[PDB]
Copies of this chain bind each other. A is one copy, B any other.
């Protein structure tokens, strides 16, 4: 028992982190097979970030201008190409620690682990959610760019995020591993609006089921609701609308606990309208939305 904000073991990803330097800019790269992936802004100076023309900036760079260091050894760069907002540096050596991997574009509301890195070295790992507005609330300092987010399914690492930018609001923005930004963001130093963020309703419900499994049951009530009535409340409290697709993925948790999805929706409705009344759920005084129904099933069953 017990329920924690658990990250995936980061070993398979640590073995892929390298340092990439171009001119005076240094950031993190991801070495998979004979390719190193990093944010394309490694070719910019601070002044270039105001309005960069990446095609023109990259044209002035050659393979020998990209310094790639893995641990203490230097990698020989034999090719370079830009794909959307990432640079792909072809190296003459395959990473011997390359795990089985995939590049995946996650959906808003999905969770992943971030391995925060500086100078190609890992400092920490944490679990977070891709917000419905395509930002992440990470912990990233200067030099953290190129740090990646991922999920693991037994021996396969599905890379889903690469860190690029911190918005003036202190929230974070990045790309998938093909260099496409999540959200409307561009890699320029210009104030960019992240949309209205909402609470990931399906995740909160999954976390309420995780609380029932671990013994926190005070929030259970004698009521029920409909998907329509619940969504009227969710919209009022800036929660994402719950669909039958969301109800479907809550099925295993509904089965284990014997608490129907709409009954759990009624508990969530009362918590939204009345608050916690100074009480806690799984050690939190607010409604947690950073665990998906899959995360709750995985943690409660022991998937290694």
- Interface positions of A (Cβ within 8 A of B): 1-11, 14-15, 115-119, 121-126, 128, 137-144, 166, 170-172, 214-215, 275-276, 278, 280, 283-286, 298-304
CB distance from A218 to the nearest CB of B (A): 15
30 CB contacts below 8 A, A to B, read A1-B141, A1-B170, A2-B138, A2-B140, A2-B166, A2-B170, A5-B5, A6-B126, A7-B125, A8-B125, A9-B10, A9-B14, A9-B115, A9-B124, A9-B125, A10-B10, A11-B15, A11-B122, A117-B304, A118-B302, A122-B304, A123-B303, A123-B304, A124-B299, A141-B302, A142-B302, A170-B214, A275-B278, A284-B284, A284-B286
Q: Which residues of B contact A117 (CB under 8 A)?
A: 304
Q: Which residues of B contact A276 (CB under 8 A)?
A: 285
Q: Which residue of B lies closest to A301 (CB)?
A: B141
Q: A115-B9, A123-B304, A304-B119 are in contact. Are A128 and B215 (CB under 8 A)?
A: no
Q: Which residues of B contact A298 (CB under 8 A)?
A: 123
* A282 and B123 alpha carbons, distance in the complex (Å): 20
Q: Which residues of B contact A275 (CB under 8 A)?
A: 278
Q: Which residue of B lies closest to A276 (CB)?
A: B285
CB distance from A199 to the nearest CB of B (A): 12
Interface residues of A, dominant DSSP: loop
Q: Which residues of B contact A285 (CB under 8 A)?
A: 276, 284-286
Give the copy number.
2
* A280 and B286 alpha carbons, distance in the complex (Å): 9
CB distance from A126 to the nearest CB of B (A): 4
Q: Which residues of B contact A7 (CB under 8 A)?
A: 7, 124-126
* A233 and B249 alpha carbons, distance in the complex (Å): 46
Q: Which residues of B contact A9 (CB under 8 A)?
A: 10-11, 14, 115, 122-125
Q: Which residue of B lies closest to A119 (CB)?
A: B304
CB distance from A17 to the nearest CB of B (A): 9
CB distance from A191 to the nearest CB of B (A): 16
* Additional A-B contacts beyond A4-B126, A6-B126 (5; CB < 8 A): A1-B139, A2-B137, A7-B124, A10-B11, A121-B304
